[PDB]
């Protein structure tokens, strides 16, 4: 198995840390690791074993350079991060230059993972670290969903015929209704290829750190098919 | 959720380590951990992370004091173990005092687990065992040995509670009967019994941490989708 990492850089990260991060942006850099740093770090400690070559494709999405249309690679060319040590380091280099934007769709990151799978038909797990706030639609002229939620669901459906599992690592306050829906209720799906894990909730419990980290890791891999 | 542990102390453990443990008893104490200790330790590092309060009801069964009728608590007035570090330490304290015996049945441990569930919110019962439940050729017992029949009956009755049973198999096997409890019990409300071959998983030559997670994911594989 190999890992793929996508990181949400949309503007909603500015306010989804109201309760869980003392009204600082989830991407704020300072004396203490923000929830994205914490997740990258713990993923490195607990899930990195499930990447066979320890090379990690990392992508960002939803900043002003990509909006809801594209992703960007952490490194020029098709060059990958060497371990989650470098994932974290590169995140910290990149964050100060980014203008957080939107709208929010998972279509571009899921399409990028589909391309990674075809560059390999080997099994992959895509890990998206995100605040859960995909663009919502209040409008009957739009149709049922926002175009972002429609495109995202369509990408999740298209990916479900590939050897790919998706894991949403949720950081911040939520709400988590949309992620829980992607987790449990996408009907046109070939198989259940989306798992939601509430990282911020798990890490806030009164248990030993190492037990919290293990609870996170197993919750993350809980829907990975039997055959692995 | 909450994790309950039951450990098999029947006499078959004296021979079910013939291949996997170089002809030593599976409960042999030394300066290297036996398969029960290996399993306790890995369960503590993995599955036990979910236990809400880190207090773990622990029981043994199948020694001379309980035979196929009862379990014994690791601690006097049913005091729970404080974390899996204490589960392991207490196991090591207890084993030298036990006379391994029989017959072998899972009815007592499953009945105890039901009692625990009823007094409590999801539970996982982990039974660490060599798989050798008492068999019989004699059909004056009915189709199954009294032990196997009472065990099946307990599994079925437990299936109406928020409880999943995971058999952590240690030693050589054979694993036919565990696979049957895993896959083939008719009157059951839901599939509440999973078999994991721990000795087979851990004997593979790969990264230790990946083996442990693979073990954990197998143990949790049949938890109902709700969780
Ligand atoms: Ca957003
Ligand atoms: Ca890789
Ligand atoms: Ca799911
Ligand atoms: Ca789920
Ligand atoms: Ca407990
Ligand atoms: Ca036995
Ligand atoms: Ca089963
Ligand atoms: Ca099974």
């Amino acid at each position: 198995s190999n890992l793929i990492v996508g990181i949400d850089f949309t503007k909603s990260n500015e306010w989804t840390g109201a309760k869980s991060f003392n009204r600082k942006s989830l991407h704020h850099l300072s004396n203490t690791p923000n929830p994205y740093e914490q997740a990258i770090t713990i993923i490195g400690r607990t899930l990195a074993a499930f990447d066979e070559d320890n090379l990690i494709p990392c992508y960002g999405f939803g900043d002003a350079s990509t909006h809801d249309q594209d992703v960007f690679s952490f490194y020029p060319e098709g060059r990958f991060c060497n371990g989650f040590e470098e994932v974290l380091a590169r995140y910290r280099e990149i964050v100060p230059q980014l203008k957080l934007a939107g709208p929010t769709s998972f279509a571009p990151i899921i399409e990028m993972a589909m391309t990674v799978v075809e560059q390999s038909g080997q099994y992959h797990v895509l890990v998206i670290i995100a605040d859960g706030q995909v663009t919502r639609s209040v409008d009957t002229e739009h149709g049922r969903l926002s175009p972002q939620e429609q495109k995202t669901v369509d990408a999740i459906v298209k990916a479900s015929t590939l050897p790919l599992s998706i894991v949403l690592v949720g950081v911040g306050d939520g709400p988590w209704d949309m992620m829980q829906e992607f987790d449990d209720n996408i009907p046109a799906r070939a198989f259940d290829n989306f798992q939601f894990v509430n990282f911020t909730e798990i890490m806030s419990k009164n248990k030993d750190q190492s037990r919290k980290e293990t609870e996170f890791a197993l919750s993350a891999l809980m829907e990975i098919p039997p055959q692995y």
Side-chain angles (χ1 to χ4, degrees), chain A residues 125-136:
Chain A
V125 176
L126 163 67
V127 184
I128 301 165
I129 314 170
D131 71 4
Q133 309 312 296
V134 172
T135 304
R136 309 183 175 263

Side-chain angles (χ1 to χ4, degrees), chain A residues 169-191:
Chain A
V169 175
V171 293
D173 296 342
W176 299 111
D177 60 307
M178 306 186 72
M179 301 303 99
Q180 287 164 335
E181 183 68 11
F182 293 162
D183 190 345
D184 303 335
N185 188 30
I186 292 184
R189 206 156 51 169
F191 87 102

Side-chain angles (χ1 to χ4, degrees), chain A residues 113-176:
Chain A
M114 292 190 307
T115 291
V116 177
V117 174
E118 311 183 18
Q119 284 171 345
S120 75
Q122 294 174 45
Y123 209 94
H124 288 68
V125 176
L126 163 67
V127 184
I128 301 165
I129 314 170
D131 71 4
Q133 309 312 296
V134 172
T135 304
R136 309 183 175 263
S137 153
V138 286
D139 188 76
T140 178
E141 296 187 353
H142 263 112
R144 34 172 251 171
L145 318 181
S146 69
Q148 288 71 31
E149 189 179 359
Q150 181 67 29
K151 293 246 254 181
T152 291
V153 164
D154 285 344
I156 285 169
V157 163
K158 197 163 55 179
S160 69
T161 59
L162 297 180
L164 175 67
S165 293
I166 308 168
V167 179
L168 197 293
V169 175
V171 293
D173 296 342
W176 299 111

Side-chain angles (χ1 to χ4, degrees), chain A residues 27-220:
Chain A
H27 284 303
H28 181 234
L29 294 177
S30 74
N31 290 281
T32 325
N34 68 41
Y36 283 87
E37 290 175 299
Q38 303 174 41
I40 292 167
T41 290
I42 288 169
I43 288 166
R45 288 191 198 125
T46 60
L47 300 173
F50 294 88
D51 188 270
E52 147 154 40
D53 64 354
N54 200 44
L55 300 175
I56 317 285
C58 296
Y59 305 93
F61 61 87
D63 71 307
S65 85
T66 55
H67 300 293
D68 64 333
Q69 298 293 309
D70 293 295
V71 301
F72 66 81
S73 318
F74 268 32
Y75 282 113
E77 315 332 340
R79 162 195 171 183
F80 298 162
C81 292
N82 226 322
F84 282 85
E85 91 158 14
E86 199 174 18
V87 174
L88 177 67
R90 186 56 176 161
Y91 168 89
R92 301 170 134 159
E93 299 172 356
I94 283 175
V95 164
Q97 304 298 324
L98 305 172
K99 172 70 166 187
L100 311 188
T104 313
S105 171
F106 297 156
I109 184 60
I110 296 173
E111 284 164 353
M112 182 57 98
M114 292 190 307
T115 291
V116 177
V117 174
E118 311 183 18
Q119 284 171 345
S120 75
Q122 294 174 45
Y123 209 94
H124 288 68
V125 176
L126 163 67
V127 184
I128 301 165
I129 314 170
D131 71 4
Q133 309 312 296
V134 172
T135 304
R136 309 183 175 263
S137 153
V138 286
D139 188 76
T140 178
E141 296 187 353
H142 263 112
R144 34 172 251 171
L145 318 181
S146 69
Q148 288 71 31
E149 189 179 359
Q150 181 67 29
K151 293 246 254 181
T152 291
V153 164
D154 285 344
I156 285 169
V157 163
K158 197 163 55 179
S160 69
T161 59
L162 297 180
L164 175 67
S165 293
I166 308 168
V167 179
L168 197 293
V169 175
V171 293
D173 296 342
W176 299 111
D177 60 307
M178 306 186 72
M179 301 303 99
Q180 287 164 335
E181 183 68 11
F182 293 162
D183 190 345
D184 303 335
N185 188 30
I186 292 184
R189 206 156 51 169
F191 87 102
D192 180 3
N193 66 341
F194 194 108
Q195 163 71 326
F196 166 65
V197 191
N198 192 329
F199 173 88
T200 289
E201 186 180 60
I202 293 172
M203 287 318 108
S204 81
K205 294 192 297 179
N206 290 279
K207 311 208 280 221
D208 165 28
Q209 179 71 16
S210 67
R211 293 184 65 239
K212 290 191 290 188
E213 291 188 15
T214 298
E215 178 181 357
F216 163 74
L218 301 173
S219 289

Side-chain angles (χ1 to χ4, degrees), chain A residues 123 224-228:
Chain A
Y123 209 94
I224 302 303
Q227 184 183 303
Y228 295 94

Side-chain angles (χ1 to χ4, degrees), chain A residues 8-16 25-27 36 100 131:
Chain A
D8 188 315
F9 289 111
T10 68
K11 197 178 177 54
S12 62
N13 285 288
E14 288 182 352
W15 56 263
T16 45
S25 168
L26 295 189
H27 284 303
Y36 283 87
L100 311 188
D131 71 4

